[PDB]
Amino acid sequence: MREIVHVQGGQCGNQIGAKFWEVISDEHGIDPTGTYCGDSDLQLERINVFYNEATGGRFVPRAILMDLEPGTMDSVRAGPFGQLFRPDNFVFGQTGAGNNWAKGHYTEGAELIDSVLDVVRKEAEGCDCLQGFQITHSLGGGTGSGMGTLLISKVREEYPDRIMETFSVFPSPKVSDTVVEPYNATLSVHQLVENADEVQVIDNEALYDICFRTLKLTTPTYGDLNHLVSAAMSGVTCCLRFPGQLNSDLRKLAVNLIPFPRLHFFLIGFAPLTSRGSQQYRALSVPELTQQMFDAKNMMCASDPRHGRYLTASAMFRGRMSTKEVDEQMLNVQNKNSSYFVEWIPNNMKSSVCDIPPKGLKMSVTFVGNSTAIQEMFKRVSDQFTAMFRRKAFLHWYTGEGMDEMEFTEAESNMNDLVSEYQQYQ
């Protein structure tokens, strides 16, 4: 049928991907041993999208784990749902790119990339005919940003016509891990604009805001943040895995979202999100759900959507629900919030209904929106990049391992024009 090959790169990508396989396996009813339990036909009818039969009855994920450091991949294996993956699909590195984009892309990543290309071709070609890839990584680190995006370049050259969706966490706006964030981010974006088909932006500070103000969790760990991102990642591929009244695949979402080929950066949201206290007090219905979906407080990028215009947005609803309220609420938002939508695209909103809700909830929605408010982040990290590059700070940890001066200027030029093009349609 249609198949998605999963690639998890870097420490962030592995730990966000580990919880993704937790949430998908539970949704399809796979035991951590790999066996099926749950006696329902709809769970198993579309399982080849993410799993492979192993002639012993067991299902193995089509996932490739990639890092340059052996530590964090051992942690994923040792944890629960860690015995699910095939041991050959783990590709280690020994030395590790110490938060260096240059050593992740040019020097240290180069002797590993041949090995990860072997394993991704083995899984990709082995079926009938592939639908796409999904890559989860970070654009702050070394191995997630450097060799993660090298894989994107190599697999686009091998499979040119297939879609390639990437879940990237951006650098945080105010306070920052890994002091060379803007060097890693700007160098990764300029060839992720030319090699990736749809790119979905996550910020850690937006996730912290959600876990404080909406979920009211006192101590959110990385376990809880990754669970939220995994919920949204499962919602975008609801339609592939379950039937629905109005079906919409990943390429259906791509054609409906991106008006011009350069701009394919999306904001992700999830609803409903209530505290344990307020679970029993809240109305679950379509009009309430669309109101939480169109909130700045619920978006997983910390960029205020009210400062720009939604060029086009899409809402993948899940659950047994009536399609008039799916239609009329999307009309309601365009009439009420007239100023926040662009005028030369009529009916900017796209709706899709999948009939199987996530476990425990009667109804849920994932929001993917192509907004021109994403220029606030591209401007911000460009200014942080231009502040450090004028004085040539931390440059010879990139210059020394074969990345010359001209590619930094090209990276800034290729990203400043992206800011300008968003202003063009504002």
């Binding site: 629905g244 109005l246 079906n247 390429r251 409906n256 030369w344 695209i345 009529p346």
Partner: protein, 428 residues
């Protein structure tokens, strides 16, 4: 002997066809297996020991809509190669459904259609069900109609289009999809009926008082219209008409074959208790502008031709009295050069009710199919919305890079512009 072949293309075509074939099975009293415990021969084939298989093909590029029919209650109703599936979706792209992933499925589809049409020559025609705003419903709809036109040249081809609504769309690329489809529906279909989604939404809100209808309650209403349309072919009546005489009676000029629909009464168990359903009153409700099923107010248009299908305990003298009242009423406008603006048709068998559905048992019903000059608004609004999108070439790179040439947008636009001038010139 005489039969009709149904083609369902796209997700909307299949799910409307699911409702259509559930009604047809219950009306002729066949079980989901396909055996009843020669009036039905126009829709079902005899296959050995009392067993009947429908004369339909299901075509979609997505497997996710057809597989549930393969595994549902109606697994063994359909012949397994009448349900044809591709591998990847058209993904709201006319160019995908027409050029790239088109040729792999249409060859298999034409093989099934040829085997189904060569059983008893003298077949009436083709019914095509599709969504105009979609990818495969528009793209594969063009390609299959081109191939059917070349092979079965002298044939009637009726199309039931789920046209996009003026306000609600549930896609963004539908101004592109609709104008490109209408170029290929103009030269390749014989009679097209426009059905709108929000028209059936508001019919279900006022007449049935369902505030939250799903796609299933829209499809039941569509199925009742098609059953009443083909009731004359299946059952005996006082004044019957087949599908060939629709073209003679509704299409005055070759390009003007766009038709509206209305069905009356559509009443629940709360309202059927309190209404008399006289032939005079159900025909008054049929011509009422908010009971039209296309969201196109006919007050600002002139009726070119109108065709009324009465079904049930209807005497022909009450039909003649009821149509006379309509002519004398001044709120409708007929065109001056069509004095005999009506075709009447009477069938004996009352409309069938699906158990556990939302309609009530009615003793008599009317289905109205009308040609009017009010259709100028429904094409001019889509003409406007394509102009906004194409102003600076939004969403074009998905079409043009993926196999069709820049300029087919312009050629389709001038064809739609020619259709607008044609409707204006006829109404003078």
């Amino acid at each position: 002997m005489r039969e009709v072949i149904s083609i369902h293309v796209g997700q909307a075509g299949i799910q409307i066809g699911n409702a259509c074939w559930e009604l047809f099975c219950l009306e002729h009293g066949i079980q989901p297996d396909g055996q009843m415990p020669d009036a039905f021969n126009t829709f079902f084939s005899e296959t050995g020991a009392g067993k009947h298989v429908p004369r339909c093909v299901f075509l979609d590029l997505e497997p996710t809509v057809v597989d549930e029919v393969r595994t549902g209650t109606y697994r063994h109703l359909f012949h397994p190669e009448q349900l044809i599936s591709g591998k990847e979706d058209a993904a709201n792209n006319f160019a995908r459904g027409h050029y790239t992933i088109g040729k792999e499925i249409v060859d298999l589809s034409l093989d099934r259609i040829r085997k189904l049409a060569d059983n008893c020559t003298g077949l009436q025609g083709f019914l095509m069900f599709n969504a105009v705003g979609g990818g495969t419903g528009s793209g594969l709809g063009c390609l299959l109609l081109e191939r059917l036109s070349v092979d079965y040249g002298k044939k009637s081809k009726l199309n039931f289009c789920s046209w996009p609504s003026p306000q609600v769309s549930t896609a963004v690329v539908e101004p592109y999809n609709s104008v490109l489809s209408t170029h290929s529906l103009l030269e390749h279909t014989d009679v097209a009926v426009m059905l709108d989604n929000e028209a059936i939404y508001d019919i279900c809100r006022r007449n049935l008082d369902i505030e939250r209808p799903t796609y299933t309650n829209l499809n039941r209403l569509i199925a009742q219209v098609i059953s009443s349309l083909t009731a004359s072919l299946r059952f005996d009546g006082a004044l019957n008409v087949d599908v060939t005489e629709f073209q003679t009676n509704l299409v005055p000029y070759p390009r003007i074959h766009f038709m509206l629909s209305s069905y009356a009464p559509i009443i629940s168990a709360e309202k059927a208790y309190h209404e008399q359903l006289s032939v005079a009153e159900i025909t008054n409700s049929a011509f009422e502008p908010a009971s039209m099923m296309a969201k196109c107010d006919p007050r600002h248009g002139k009726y070119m031709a109108c065709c009324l299908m009465y079904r049930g305990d209807v005497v022909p003298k009450d039909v003649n009295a009821a149509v006379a009242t309509i002519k004398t009423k001044r709120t409708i406008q007929f065109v001056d050069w069509c004095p005999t603006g009506f075709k009447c048709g009477i069938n004996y068998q009352p409309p069938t009710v699906v158990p556990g559905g939302d309609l009530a048992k009615v003793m008599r019903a009317v289905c109205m199919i009308s040609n009017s000059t009010a259709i100028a608004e429904v094409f001019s609004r889509m003409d406007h919305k394509f102009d906004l999108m194409y102003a600076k070439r939004a969403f074009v790179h998905w079409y043009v890079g993926e196999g069709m040439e820049e300029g087919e947008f312009s050629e389709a636009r001038e064809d739609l512009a020619a259709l607008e001038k044609d409707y204006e010139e006829v109404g003078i």
